[PDB]
Amino acid sequence: APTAPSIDMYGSNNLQFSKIELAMETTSGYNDMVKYHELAKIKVKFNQWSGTSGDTYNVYFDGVKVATGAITGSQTTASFEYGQGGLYQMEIEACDATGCSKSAPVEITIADTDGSHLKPLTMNVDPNNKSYNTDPSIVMGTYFVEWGIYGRDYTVDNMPVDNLTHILYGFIPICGPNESVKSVGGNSFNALQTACRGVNDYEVVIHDPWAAYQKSFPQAGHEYSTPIKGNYAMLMALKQRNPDLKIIPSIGGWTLSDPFYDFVDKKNRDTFVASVKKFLKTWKFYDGVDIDWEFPGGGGAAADKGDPVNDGPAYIALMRELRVMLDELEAETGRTYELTSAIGVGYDKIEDVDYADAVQYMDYIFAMTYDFYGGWNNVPGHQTALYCGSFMRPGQCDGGGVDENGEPYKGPAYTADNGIQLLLAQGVPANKLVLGTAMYGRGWEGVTPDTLTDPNDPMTGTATGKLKGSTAQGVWEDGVIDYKGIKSFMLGANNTGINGFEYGYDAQAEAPWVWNRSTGELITFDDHRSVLAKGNYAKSLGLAGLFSWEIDADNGDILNAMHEGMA
């Protein structure tokens, strides 16, 4: 027998190989930065410096032959290709007429985007997140935002993964018209323009590749040579810890919806659907697609956009066309893919789409039962209430009434229940509807006692402007505040109110507030009680379950209440 091969670790790139090639130190077009190969190129050097080297070699992964070739004297390079990611015990065997000799086994790493090659992610979750025994058939969803790793300092390993069925990753942009992105900033718009260089309009790209796959997270054990890093590598490792977890990319949202209005032309839908198929094959940890078009018919960031006649049919056709594509992927891979959408629940939004038609192609509708009122104007209201609040005028709840100035309420008020009922009224099955909880508040200032029409209800007052605060308080944008900020800075440990604030609750609407009478600061949010009410509502109607926006803003209280209400 020949001398047993000695595998050359140093000369073989430390046995680290990858199906994906990702730019780490530059920023350019998506197709320039991201290169996916169906087979990883494997190059293993070995030596047989003493005795006979033999005629041929065999390469084994976990005792199974994967490659063969000729020995070239006392130093041989074994080159081959491999289409499956993972960690394998590799042996290299040398053979001649007398027999064969196997090397010592050594671990080879082949990176793929399913995370097969990765150990379960090490978690660092706030212990306030409690343990539950929620029925696994109940949707318990949340949004994780790409940009949350910056100021918000909220990373993948912070997510209470055991308390979640679905993680929606916000947000995936579509190349094309994107003027609304400028409302976030020039930097964000420029990032998107850079990502879209050498990319056809209406194709998907990664907005922030630094956050997505470049940034080294030490808690994930990322090193200079690690082929996949950032949030994406961490989500891959998360899937290894929780293999039943569904991770779904969310396309669009408030500032990334502009290209959706061009989907009235099927040619653009064709381009989009094809790019999503490619995206899902490239990033294998993803379990389907979430469409967050805000909104068919208009009413989104771009005030001028919207086709009330053609957007609904385009939306239905998109769902049908995505489902056809996902079915293709299911046949090719043996996997199951989900198709979802986050939708507006105001009467004016729902009426622009036949959801009974659209939903036949969809697994879930994430009903965005929040943002009903906010600092965009001086009108206080419950931003995420279940029912009609005390502040609402006669005829406001169901519509048909008139406001304080005499202008007609053209449709039902913005509440969670009104939205759900309008969807059911179209004939949408309850078991496809997912009810939304808010992990943040919206707020005003200047709502002082003298502005109230009902002295016991600050929701009847009038504001002078938006809520202001620091990022330490969870105020990243004026008029918006993390729930964990509200708890730490307005509610306090006993929810009795701190720093000048009092707690209140509209028992009818199922909606909490905190109110500082002196400054007139007023915040509308979800708390334990209102979330329980939502959970009880979901059970009663046989809804699919609950979802939340956004997990980084929770301290555990909201997701805790979600599970406790679904019990």
Q: Which of 363, 365, 302, 297 is nearest to 546 (CA)?
A: 365
| Helices 416-426 and 528-541, axial angle in degrees (round to 10) | 20
Strand 465-466 to 480-482 pairing: unpaired
CA distances from 184 to 180, 188, 256, 477, 558 (A): 8, 7, 10, 10, 27
Q: What is the per-residue DSSP string for 48-89? A: --SS---SEEEEEETTEEEEEEE--TTEEEEEEEE---EEEE
CA distances from 478 to 373, 467, 527 (A): 14, 6, 21
- Report how far residue 344's alpha carbon sits from residue 355's, in angstroms, rounded to the nearest whole number: 12
Strand 246-252 to 364-368 pairing: unpaired
The first and second tokens of residue 554, run together, are 């929770």
Instruction: With residue 505 as reference, give the H or E element that holds it.
Output: strand 502-506
Half-sphere exposure of 550 (CA within 13 A, CB side): 21
The residues, any chain, with a CB within 8 Å of residue 275's CB and separated by 6 or more, are: 200, 202, 203, 204
* Structural domains of the chain sorted by starting position, each given as residue range(s) with its CATH number in brackets: 1-111 (2.60.40.10), 112-438+525-567 (3.20.20.80), 439-524 (3.10.50.10)
- Report how far residue 502's alpha carbon sits from residue 447's, in angstroms, rounded to the nearest whole number: 13
The separation between the first and the last C-alpha atoms of the chain, rounded to the nearest angstrom, is: 67
- Report how far residue 382's alpha carbon sits from residue 507's, in angstroms, rounded to the nearest whole number: 12
Q: Which residues of 416-453 are buried (b: 16+ CB within 10 A; e: fewer)?
A: bbbbbebbbeeebeeebbbbbbbbbbbbbbbbbeebbe
Q: Which of 1, 88, 11, 70 is nearest to 46 (CA)?
A: 11
The first and second tokens of residue 386, run together, are 């279940």
Cis peptide before 146 (omega within 30 of 0): no
| Helices 266-282 and 311-333, axial angle in degrees (round to 10) | 30
Strand 521-524 to 511-516 pairing: antiparallel
The first and second tokens of residue 142, run together, are 């949340």
CA distances from 60 to 52, 57, 71, 169 (A): 21, 10, 16, 38
The residues, any chain, with a CB within 8 Å of residue 185's CB and separated by 6 or more, are: none
Catalytic residue among 294, 510, 521, 550: 294
- Report how far residue 498's alpha carbon sits from residue 495's, in angstroms, rounded to the nearest whole number: 8
Strand 56-61 to 86-95 pairing: antiparallel
Q: Which of 245, 248, 219 is nearest to 162 (CA)?
A: 245
The residues, any chain, with a CB within 8 Å of residue 184's CB and separated by 6 or more, are: 255
- Report how far residue 548's alpha carbon sits from residue 170's, in angstroms, rounded to the nearest whole number: 12
The residues, any chain, with a CB within 8 Å of residue 486's CB and separated by 6 or more, are: 441, 474, 514, 523, 525
Q: What angle do CA 355, 416, 368 make, to 5 degrees?
A: 60
> Are 70 and 55 contacting, i.e. CB atoms less than 8 angstroms apart?
yes
- What sign for the dihedral angle of Cα 420, 424, 429, 430? positive
Half-sphere exposure of 372 (CA within 13 A, CB side): 36
Residue type, position 111, single letter? A
Cis peptide before 80 (omega within 30 of 0): no
- Report how far residue 284's alpha carbon sits from residue 233's, in angstroms, rounded to the nearest whole number: 11
Count the Cβ atoms, other than its own, within 10 Å of residue 126. Answer: 12
The first and second tokens of residue 220, run together, are 């994930």
Q: Which of 384, 522, 386 is nearest to 461 (CA)?
A: 522
The yes-or-no answer on residue 338 being catalytic is no
Q: What angle do CA 265, 268, 273 make, to 5 degrees?
A: 125
- Report how far residue 12's alpha carbon sits from residue 177's, in angstroms, rounded to the nearest whole number: 46
Contacts 24+ apart (CB under 8 A), 409-413: 410/348, 411/346, 411/347, 411/348, 411/351, 412/347, 413/388
The residues, any chain, with a CB within 8 Å of residue 525's CB and separated by 6 or more, are: 383, 384, 438, 440, 441, 442, 481, 483, 486, 512, 513, 514
The first and second tokens of residue 312, run together, are 């609904």
- Report how far residue 104's alpha carbon sits from residue 92's, in angstroms, rounded to the nearest whole number: 8
Q: What are phi and psi of 142, to 5 degrees?
A: -155, 160
The first and second tokens of residue 223, run together, are 């090193």
Q: Which of 233, 196, 227, 192 is nearest to 211 (CA)?
A: 233
> Are 112 and 20 contacting, i.e. CB atoms less than 8 angstroms apart?
yes
By three-state DSSP, how is residue 361 classified?
A: helix
Q: What is the per-residue DSSP string for 130-182? A: ------TTSEEEEEEEGGGGSTT---GGGS-GGG-SEEEEEEE-BSS--GGGG
SS3 labels along 260-308: HHHHHCHHHHHHHHHHHHHHHHHCCCCCEEEEECCCCCCCCCCCCCCCC
- Report how far residue 488's alpha carbon sits from residue 511's, in angstroms, rounded to the nearest whole number: 19
> Are 271 and 281 contacting, i.e. CB atoms less than 8 angstroms apart?
no
Q: Which of 176, 191, 173 is nearest to 29 (CA)?
A: 191
Instruction: With residue 31 as reference, give the H or E element that holds it.
Output: helix 30-33
Q: What are phi and psi of 526, to 5 degrees?
A: -110, 140
Residue type, position 123, single letter? M
> Are 290 and 168 contacting, i.e. CB atoms less than 8 angstroms apart?
yes
The first and second tokens of residue 106, run together, are 């050594």
Count the Cβ atoms, other than its own, within 10 Å of residue 65. Answer: 11
Q: Which technique was used to obtain these atomic coordinates?
A: X-ray
- Report how far residue 468's alpha carbon sits from residue 523's, in angstroms, rounded to the nearest whole number: 11
- Report how far residue 68's alpha carbon sits from residue 57's, in angstroms, rounded to the nearest whole number: 6
Q: What is the resolution of this structure in A?
A: 2.0
